[PDB]
Design an enzyme around this catalytic site. Structure first.
Site, mmCIF file in Angstrom:
data_model
loop_
_atom_site.group_PDB
_atom_site.id
_atom_site.type_symbol
_atom_site.label_atom_id
_atom_site.label_comp_id
_atom_site.label_asym_id
_atom_site.label_seq_id
_atom_site.Cartn_x
_atom_site.Cartn_y
_atom_site.Cartn_z
ATOM 1 N N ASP A 1 30.794 46.328 41.082
ATOM 2 C CA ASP A 1 32.193 45.959 41.297
ATOM 3 C C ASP A 1 32.472 44.511 40.902
ATOM 4 O O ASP A 1 33.060 43.747 41.667
ATOM 5 C CB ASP A 1 32.596 46.190 42.759
ATOM 6 C CG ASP A 1 34.104 46.162 42.961
ATOM 7 O OD1 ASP A 1 34.841 46.383 41.976
ATOM 8 O OD2 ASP A 1 34.552 45.917 44.101
ATOM 9 N N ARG B 1 38.329 39.110 41.728
ATOM 10 C CA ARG B 1 38.456 39.107 43.183
ATOM 11 C C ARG B 1 37.104 38.917 43.871
ATOM 12 O O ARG B 1 37.041 38.467 45.014
ATOM 13 C CB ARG B 1 39.105 40.405 43.667
ATOM 14 C CG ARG B 1 40.549 40.582 43.228
ATOM 15 C CD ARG B 1 41.496 39.663 43.979
ATOM 16 N NE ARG B 1 41.496 39.918 45.415
ATOM 17 C CZ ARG B 1 42.390 39.415 46.260
ATOM 18 N NH1 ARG B 1 43.365 38.637 45.810
ATOM 19 N NH2 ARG B 1 42.315 39.697 47.553
ATOM 20 N N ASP C 1 29.481 39.391 46.946
ATOM 21 C CA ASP C 1 29.223 40.795 47.274
ATOM 22 C C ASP C 1 28.405 41.538 46.220
ATOM 23 O O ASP C 1 28.713 42.679 45.874
ATOM 24 C CB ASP C 1 30.545 41.527 47.512
ATOM 25 C CG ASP C 1 31.368 40.894 48.617
ATOM 26 O OD1 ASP C 1 30.768 40.316 49.547
ATOM 27 O OD2 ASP C 1 32.612 40.977 48.559
HETATM 28 CL CL LIG Z 1 38.931 42.802 47.024
#
Ligand SMILES: [Cl-]
Ligand SMILES: [Cl-]
Ligand SMILES: [Cl-]
Length: 296
Positions: free
Chosen positions: A157, A161, A175
């Site tokens: 991902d 962001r 992340d």
């Molecule tokens: Cl997000």
């Protein structure tokens, strides 16, 4: 109780952690004595913790991320592990703090008041970024991903962001150590901050849910587009429903208004339909380094 693993090289006494304001659960905090050479220095940090409704699996996921960071190790351009609190209470995973928030909102707030970018939604506008700043920004993200790739970490991902900016404007990937869900989670489902992760997914990840370093490279392409649109939203006016069909038929986003032909070609390369033809982060780092030098 469960059995949380204590790890003496990373364990921090809770009294050494002073909880500040929430980040996103993640909160701002101050840590006294992180470097136990310097017990009198407070360090501003971010603290990952479970939500009030958390489950056993959620706990297991947080531990997974924690242990994963240990095995992946440190790099300038990733959100690093700093410590953890496993004793006397709720699990706290302490990571590096990036005061300037995620890259997308960072860019949007810095848009010129012109109109060949979309409007600057920030009530607190900042100075705008030079052409060399933007390319240097892409370079840092590539360097972080190049390191992660070398550690066999696949992000699944990568997006603006999920890139954080420090006080000193250093880009850090966030992340990256999250655990992959063993159940078929709907990617059409909008995330908490309203983003649709599907728009960053490679075709093979959309179709057979095969995630690889090459699929991460695809995402980096979309991230490249985000940078040179200063936080733009991908595939404008395209329903998610039809995104895969369009990609298969070879649809690709058009070049951002202010973007060199070289950099757009880089995006396109990252968006190659055959995964093996896409460049590697290694190649991406090299090329972007040259381009940074020539942009000035
Ligand atoms: Cl997000
Ligand atoms: Cl979006
Ligand atoms: Cl936009």
């Amino acid at each position: 109780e469960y059995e949380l693993p204590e790890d003496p090289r990373w364990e921090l006494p809770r009294d050494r952690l002073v909880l500040g304001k929430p980040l996103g659960q993640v909160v701002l905090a101050e840590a006294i004595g992180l470097d136990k050479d310097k017990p009198n220095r407070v360090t501003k940090v971010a603290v990952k913790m479970l939500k009030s409704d958390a489950t056993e699996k959620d706990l297991s996921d947080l531990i997974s991320e924690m242990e994963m960071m240990k095995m992946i190790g440190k790099h300038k351009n990733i959100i690093n592990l700093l410590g953890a609190c496993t004793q006397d209470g709720p699990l706290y995973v302490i990571v590096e703090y990036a005061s300037k928030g995620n890259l997308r909102e960072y860019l949007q707030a810095r848009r010129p008041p012109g109109l060949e970018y979309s409007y600057n939604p920030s009530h607190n506008p900042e100075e705008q970024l030079s052409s060399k700043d933007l390319v240097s920004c892409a370079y840092q993200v590539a360097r972080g991903m190049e390191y992660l790739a070398s550690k066999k970490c696949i992000h699944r991902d990568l997006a603006a962001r999920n890139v954080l900016v420090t006080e000193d404007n250093v880009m850090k990937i966030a992340d990256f150590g999250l655990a992959r869900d063993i159940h078929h989670i709907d990617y059409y489902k909008k995330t908490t901050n309203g983003r649709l992760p599907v728009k960053w997914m490679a075709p093979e990840a959309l179709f057979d849910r095969i995630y690889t370093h090459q699929s991460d490279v695809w995402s980096f392409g979309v991230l490249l587009w985000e940078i040179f649109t200063l936080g733009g939203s991908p595939y404008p006016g395209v329903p998610v429903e039809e995104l895969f069909k369009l990609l298969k038929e070879g649809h690709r986003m058009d070049k951002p208004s202010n973007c060199t032909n070289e950099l757009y070609m880089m995006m396109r390369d990252c968006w190659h339909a055959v995964p093996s033809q896409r460049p590697t982060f290694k190649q991406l780092v090299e090329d972007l380094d040259r381009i940074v030098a020539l942009t000035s």
